[PDB]
Design a protein around this ligand. Structure first.
Ligand SMILES: [Mg+2]
Ligand SMILES: [Mg+2]
Ligand SMILES: [Mg+2]
Ligand SMILES: [Mg+2]
Ligand SMILES: [Mg+2]
Ligand SMILES: [Mg+2]
Ligand SMILES: [Mg+2]
Ligand SMILES: [Mg+2]
Ligand SMILES: [Mg+2]
Ligand SMILES: [Mg+2]
Ligand SMILES: [Mg+2]
Ligand SMILES: [Mg+2]
Length: 55
RNA sequence: UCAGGGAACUGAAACAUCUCAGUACCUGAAGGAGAAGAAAGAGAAUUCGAUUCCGUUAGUAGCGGCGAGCGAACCCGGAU
RNA sequence: UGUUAUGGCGUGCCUAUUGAAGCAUGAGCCGGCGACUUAGACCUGACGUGCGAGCUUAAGUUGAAAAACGGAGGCGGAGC
RNA sequence: AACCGAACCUGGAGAUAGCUAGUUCUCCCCGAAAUGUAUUGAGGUACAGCCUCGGAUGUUGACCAUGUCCUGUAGAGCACUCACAAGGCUAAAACCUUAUGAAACUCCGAAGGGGCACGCGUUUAGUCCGGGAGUGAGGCUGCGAGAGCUAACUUCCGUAGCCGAGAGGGAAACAACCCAGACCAUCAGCUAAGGUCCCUAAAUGAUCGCUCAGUGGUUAAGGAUGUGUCGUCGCAUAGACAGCCAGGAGGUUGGCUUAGAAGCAGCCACCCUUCAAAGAGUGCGUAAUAGCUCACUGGUCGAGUGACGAUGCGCCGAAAAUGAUCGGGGCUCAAGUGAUCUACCGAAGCUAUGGAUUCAACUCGCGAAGCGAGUUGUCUGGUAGGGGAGCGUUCAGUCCGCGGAGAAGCCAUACCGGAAGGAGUGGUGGAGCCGACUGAAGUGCGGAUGCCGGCAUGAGU
RNA sequence: UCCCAAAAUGUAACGGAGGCGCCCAAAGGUCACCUCAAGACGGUUGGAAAUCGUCUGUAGAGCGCAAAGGUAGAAGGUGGCUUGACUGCGAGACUGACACGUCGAGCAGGGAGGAAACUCGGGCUUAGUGAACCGGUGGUACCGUGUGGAAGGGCCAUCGAUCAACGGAUAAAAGUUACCCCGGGGAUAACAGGCUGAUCUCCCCCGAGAGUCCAUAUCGGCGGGGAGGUUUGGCACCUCGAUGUCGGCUCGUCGCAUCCUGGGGCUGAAGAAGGUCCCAAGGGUUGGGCUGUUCGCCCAUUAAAGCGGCACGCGAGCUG
RNA sequence: CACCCCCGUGCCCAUAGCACUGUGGAACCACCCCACCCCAUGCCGAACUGGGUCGUGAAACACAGCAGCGCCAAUGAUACUCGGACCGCAGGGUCCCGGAAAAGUCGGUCAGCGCGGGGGUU
């Protein structure tokens, strides 16, 4: 999976805030190649609607 | 400075004990200073040895609706 | 730099508030005055200095266009 | 002795004031709370919760996953408790069939949640000791409940988010809604939400439709041959529907009831006969009559017609007080609305170039850490509060000095520094005075119906 | 203790229901044993249940009280013997801001019941409680201000508390002020405004039925759907360093759910006079008696003598 | 576990329970018999208990058949819901994404697994 942040964290529940933190994002527009493994699969899915899950 | 008489606000988050204080104030007497003073004493060593003042002991002993809070003296150092 | 025209944008300040342009408080304007301090050998901690398993003096004493002396006493040092 | 439910002056006295007001220089780092419990407590205190600073530990913190255990709400169900509908049955209860409702019912029972382990993963916190706090009036919205008229910018709890302490774009305007979290500079760029006729930036864009209402741009029960699209009967050139000419029956004023009611106030039925036909009957009408048409029948024409379901958009139902409107202009030859595609505008978001700050690792300078600089990365909204570095004012000690060809103070100015602030030059002035290090402070002001003084407004009233 | 509480815990309200301030020498410890409610059939005073008997019987009963969980291989129901309804402790946890509170293996001293394993430091559990201060009683020998005693004190145990406004301001305590005073508050009231609309006002839907006959000329049971914001209120948002309060008088102005004039449909409209609904606010809408009145009642008239809004319009305009 | 059955005791603890029916007897079990006292029923040795045949298998029991009742219980579709995104003034409601019941239906079964002792296969 390939991640890119495209939606504000503001006005979003804590958990998503967290997953955004953990997944290592700081500013919308940031991105990062991501590991294909359950825990991290979960990271992305959880806050799917905020990230642009590349492919 | 001593003496005769002697508050309340206030504290204790109320209040009557107690606190504020024997302070504030009134009055009497006196001096340059007073007051105190030569032991029917203090202390626990069979010790010190008139009075007064500073240090300390001690915020200890203790007092207290044992609450708020109040608070010694001996010893020891020094003025004399 | 000064002044100005037109355009865009634009809800004094403070206080008190859940919320102030607020038809909520304060204030005519300027100048000057105007508010977290001082003390206690008090407690408690940060930083720093001197000594360091030891560390300090208080009152006073004598000198002072200067500061030494002064261990009475206090704090470490055994707890329950 | 010009304001007596207790005179006046001085004094205790800076009475107390858990209350109100005020609280003065700068830049930088973090950054709350409006909760729980107790309180003669409820606009106040204590403790904890939440902030900060130091020291310690130094990944235990975060999230997401897998595993395991626990929970009974939602739903459901009716096997118990209570309630409840149709029937049977029986000498009403239980019993049986059919049928139901439950916050305080449960045979059942998710989603989710929570504890513990590990981390198989990616993160970046946690914890403990100690100094300093502030906060203990919250608010709106969504979702789940109670309270309340399933009223309220209502009230009380749970839970998420934002305001509070949050600027920026959008929603005309507008705390909290939507998109987004402001280190500083830049006539640079791409986007979010929202938008792209003109008032403002951008397609009066493209394709297939919908509504004529200005719906759009203030509601409903309900009403209606207003349109659009799907479904059902239906009834039908062997010539219907609507229209037209003509007909319309005999029993029977059907029996019943009535003061009577003869197809039509109300009980009972709704059969017979002829026929091509014509039903004891539509509605109107009288005191019943009567009269007027219908269903059933033929020609004349010649193609469809008729009636319920649904839905899409729209019409009526839709009356309030200063003068109207969708923000306005104006819009149907859409700037309205359903679906679809694409381009552009659009924030202080993301990006670009430049620079500063924060913390960290990397370098060296140094005889030490500590501190300076240099890199790389990182951070940098902010109210109460905590922490850091500094500016300025007087006084004092010390250093260098300065001044009548002229000090301080005053006045002007396009310079300097990251700020507090500093300097240069000129004018005024007429005598004391800068800069630097260190020390002490009655040390910095717009607020206090502040104090003293000066001068304004009302007004030439 | 139930429900609210949103399946962990916790969680408010002057939200919905209900109990406690005890009780038991045995309703305890231990050791044995029995097992319920209730229906049916059949049986004596009985006759409804109840006593006896026989089948069925997850218990639909019981458990001292309120409920919930729990429970029959018993915590349910009898009898024997005992006292643990004990002392000295207490690993480890639950729970609380603290202070309290709760559960608890194991150790010792001594015991009780059982043949024995073993069980026993109160009762199936969850309410039956009250700091500390001051004092009472039994015990103990720790202090005891020169010494030894003694008073007194301390340590153990234990009694005294609707201090229930139940974390309790004192040993000891009620009302009044319109004679009032100060500090504050729009944190919270009365006026008005705001939000809401139960209530109030008006409109529409259905149509039983009244209307000789005929539901709709009129009127409309029961029940339903909306509007207005003029009532009484609910809420409590600005205002308590002041938004003057009822009525009148003067001055007006606006809405329309029109009182009168104007135009219409239907009528159960002969004409005259009315009723009713639709359209329509241009203008107009009298003077007096009673009452502060607003209202309303009445006199005498009128085309009519409308209903509301503007801080229940208008006090820096007057009245009072 | 050579084949069987019987008795005791487990795991499991209703898809292993009930009922209806049949099988078993002198190995085992039970009924049955007497029981003055050991010990005993708040009256009854009914039950506890002591001493034993016969007789029986009727009862109780064991086993076997059966599924009429119990108990178990799919799938499919639905209820509901974590997450995302919307609607209606409101009561309430919807789309996308996972999770996903309860009831009922199909059908499932009257267990299965141990240890030990006894007696049989004339
Ligand atoms: Mg005020
Ligand atoms: Mg004063
Ligand atoms: Mg409705
Ligand atoms: Mg001023
Ligand atoms: Mg009033
Ligand atoms: Mg009011
Ligand atoms: Mg007329
Ligand atoms: Mg006025
Ligand atoms: Mg079932
Ligand atoms: Mg999902
Ligand atoms: Mg959802
Ligand atoms: Mg789904």
């Amino acid at each position: 999976m390939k991640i890119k942040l495209v939606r504000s964290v503001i006005g979003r529940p804590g958990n998503q805030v967290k997953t955004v933190q953990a997944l290592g994002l700081r500013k919308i527009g940031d991105s990062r190649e991501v590991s294909d493994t359950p825990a991290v699969r979960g990271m992305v899915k959880t806050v799917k609607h905020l990230l642009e899950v590349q492919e």
